[PDB]
Subunit: 181 residues, 8 copies
């Protein structure tokens, strides 16, 4: 099965077909893994607009989007607001707790869940989900564990790539509309 990023297995496509919830890591997935820090305590993070468009397409194609992140920042709240992401868990080490809460609130089986991570701290959740995704430049020890490895790096369109994959699998890609913000 061909995609606009390269061929994927029938098994990966079958997994993506069932996804009702896409959970995303922030650092190294939605960003390039950097943290910008200033002398007056300012903190910045870079997000990618094409990911934003992808998220918008998913959110309006009956695919819920969630975020579970180890750090905690107001800027992430602002980013979730502008994209319309209502499910946000910040400052969590053991991400299994947020994951159990998500499966509870949305009444959703783990087989209908996809997760995109970039480090070993993400694997406990990724192990349980229907479609585990590692970004192109994730930690070397995570890459072979995931169901699908993206072609695009974290913060460069890896999330858009996953969004495109889910929509294509469900026959929603051609008629998908979002906002490139």
């Amino acid at each position: 099965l061909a995609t606009c990023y390269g061929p994927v297995s029938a098994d990966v496509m079958a997994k993506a077909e069932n996804i009702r919830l896409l959970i995303l890591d922030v650092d190294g997935v939605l960003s390039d893994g950097l943290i910008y820090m200033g002398n007056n305590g300012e903190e910045l993070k870079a997000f990618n607009v094409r990911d934003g468009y992808g998220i918008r397409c998913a959110l309006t194609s009956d695919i819920e989007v969630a975020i579970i992140t180890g750090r905690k920042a107001k800027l992430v709240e602002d980013r979730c607001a502008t994209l319309g992401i209502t499910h946000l868990y910040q400052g969590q080490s053991n991400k299994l707790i947020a994951f159990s809460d998500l499966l509870e609130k949305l009444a959703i089986a783990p087989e209908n869940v996809a997760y995109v991570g970039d480090d070993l701290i993400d694997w406990p959740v990724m192990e349980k989900v229907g479609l585990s995704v590692a970004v192109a430049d994730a930690h070397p020890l995570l890459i072979p564990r995931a169901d699908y490895v993206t072609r695009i790096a974290g913060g460069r369109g890896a999330v858009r790539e996953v969004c495109d994959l889910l929509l294509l699998a469900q026959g929603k890609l051609d008629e998908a509309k979002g906002q490139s913000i």
Copy 2:
């Protein structure tokens, strides 16, 4: 014929000869597709100074330069001011509305218009223009659709490349002068 970025087709050269208006996307085209967000509500974007030089050369050589963007930020208005861009459309989901508004105000035919984009939301406009351009690292589904694909990535000199192309085709490249800002 020969350009400093590599050979281009005669058809692309001929399209570029009639361009009286260059419409530019912002995110992914004039920038590398990143939005910097802070904890105090700050927002940054990165612009390329060699693109600035190209835009100046275009404006000072009878080629109007316009911007249509899906995002809305004051920093964009500032950047347009410093470059002497007077045509700015922000927060536009359906870019056809703004595109139609531009052509009626400037009294210019769609064939005399070039558009440089990076995502699928730009295509409805790009389809109608004389010279459609996708940046090197545009969305993979956009690339095969455009009349021309730049060698240089978004935010790295892709706009300059397009400006160089228009000027050369119009025999203005030798005499064109600008400010590297």
Copy 3:
């Protein structure tokens, strides 16, 4: 739409749908452009096995395969014979002559012909065909002229890529065998 080598335009896919004959340049297209010459007058040329599979797929799926070369070698006859190619023109400077001979013999319109080339001498023929193809590492001046530029280089699987494209466009890719 989507291909295993990456996205292609609607216009290119429409062109590939109509192809009944694929004409192939040899040097730089079926080979990496190299000529091996020996002291006893030996001559070798390298061919790609995956191109072979693609040509066998096309030939058994209603797509005829032809060759027009500027060089002349017995080894090229041997290669065609093993692949079941019957239309071979060697030592052809002006490739337009061999081209007209093919359209006549097979009773085929130039719109239903694809040509894969790598140098400027191939252009007079590529201009006339429905689907012109330059290989990834073709001469720089030929590349922007073609309808489609391959992702794979000459002798590396560029021909297989084109066979894949024709069979995909014709809905034959799944069923085809080589």
Copy 4:
């Protein structure tokens, strides 16, 4: 776990551990996919010496090496004789005849069988084996189907790579000895 070619999944390492027979494709796997032909009818094929060493290590460390190829030439016979490969099947469209012959002769289950191929014609065999492998530069559609994809290209050491993996997983790589021929 970690290999000298990069991390592999526990799944691949566990599959490699269980392997008693290694079936190898020739063209595009043991060679770089090229057929060198001459005017007098001479034919050449190129092989990699570091692959040779790996085959000698596998054969000396209780792993069988077998070849199923669609082509037929005397040179392939000669290569196998220099390596001590006793199981060779040439000129076959359907590689399932040879694969099943190899299972009855060695009394070996499909799971203890690993296959290295580079094209779609190999897939029927690889589908049924314990560890299916595709070389780095295999046909794009074959790549996502394999359990393992080699880092090294066909004819460059993709076979050595698989031999190194088979030996590592079996704890034989430390004291494995071969001849670089």
Copy 5:
């Protein structure tokens, strides 16, 4: 000996086993060598979260992490505060003074120390330590002097690479746990 970044020498793995103190450069090691400066006198630097996870792993595994910088910035104090780095030295031109100071305070022999640098100013200290490390994109002249050259660039996970190496050498990597901060 196999790591997830590729093979390392037995001597490097032996040196890495004895490490109780890891001293790190900031600029070009924890960052990509860039200083972001503003008109109101702002200063930003970028850090890598996967480096943070590595640092947290070392500190919780009996490996002290310290920093010696030639620059002085409040932002760096903040980054150290998040990671649990208690030994910070800023504004220091001659890094030997800070180096001698650390060994005296921690009662540690130089052979039990590792240093990760990127420029020639780091060498006088690196020469003395048990394990000297130059990052992948360090100054050309520093690279051949170091015991180990990282595969990953400064600011992109070179520090995490060293942490992973130290933990594997000491048999602590499997059980090592940190926070991606």
Copy 6:
């Protein structure tokens, strides 16, 4: 002769031997050509620390460093202050004026001057100096005009590279000591 960035011509080394003044462009030479802008008028630019070390080595080794830039920002003054650069020209559209002034004030012949540029507006000055330099990623049309093309891209160490070259040509490289700032 051999340098740590690769071989250089005998003419380039002879030209570097005579250099008493190094003139640098800012944008695309000391930076990667990006301008960061915010919604509150904030302006940011990124500088490279290893460039800073080079400039420090040059200034302390009897090579004067000057800057001529077409933009104007306070942050550039802050950078020049820290590096000890006293010759700065901002908002300079025609760079030939600042060049004439520098030769006048410092009593220096153009043959003893080096200029590092990245765009075509730099050329009128570069044409007159003893050693003209284009950065690796300078505008395509400037590259073939320059006496030397750096290996390193602008804002990534292109200036450190030129600094190393001048110091090597003059036999000051080993004696050179600066601050990594």
Copy 7:
């Protein structure tokens, strides 16, 4: 000026404009620098067909082509015969001897001569000619010495590139025609 291989300097184009004779190295220039030797005393060498087309264009556009090679083989004579090269010197250790003979025979000044080489043994002749050319993958010490360094590697179209440059400079490229042999 712009070429299909990228920009070249005005000085390079001026040198190319005067060229009446192009002299070529064989090994590393017309070939990829390989010698194929066999057990029966067979010797092979690889030539590039697009180089042959370029050579045919040169000879038919009032540009004499000649070869000076340090080795001697009958295959080279055969190659020259197919291309119509009539000036061939083999087994040539001091290439200045053949160079003088050629210039005497054709009554041509050193300035009207171009030489394409790949190794240091070629420099004494290259130093004297109007246009000296080192191929992209020439010996690293030769590269900085040449007037022009080709973009394309030896045996891959470096000679075609030089032919293309001479024809363009002399205004003969559009109407130049050869045979792809």
Copy 8:
């Protein structure tokens, strides 16, 4: 000190200054690792002529060049003949035997010997010599063990690089005169 392939360590250079004997592997060192086999029992192996020039330079500069290879072919004898190599051992599985014979015959201490290899079978010999060299594309497990790793791949100029290194260290590089064969 600095070389035309990049900086080497002061240790590697000091080792290179003592080298009187250069022992070379064949397959993967003087060639790219390929064995060409034919239907009528023909064998070919490709040699690099720039390597030949380097070997000629070594042999004329008080550096003996020897060969120990695991395979056995008349073509290798022919290649040694043309280069003037008289010390050739073929079909050697345990290379320590021929190594002991060499040191015995030439009356040379192992510290004054250099070995260039590409696989693990070379290591027992490399472990004993003064300068062990692994080629750029050697087996991954060999690379970290060698004193020096070449920039150039086997059969592409790796041997030339080593020759250039020995001559440079002994002050004979500009001196060096050979035949490009």
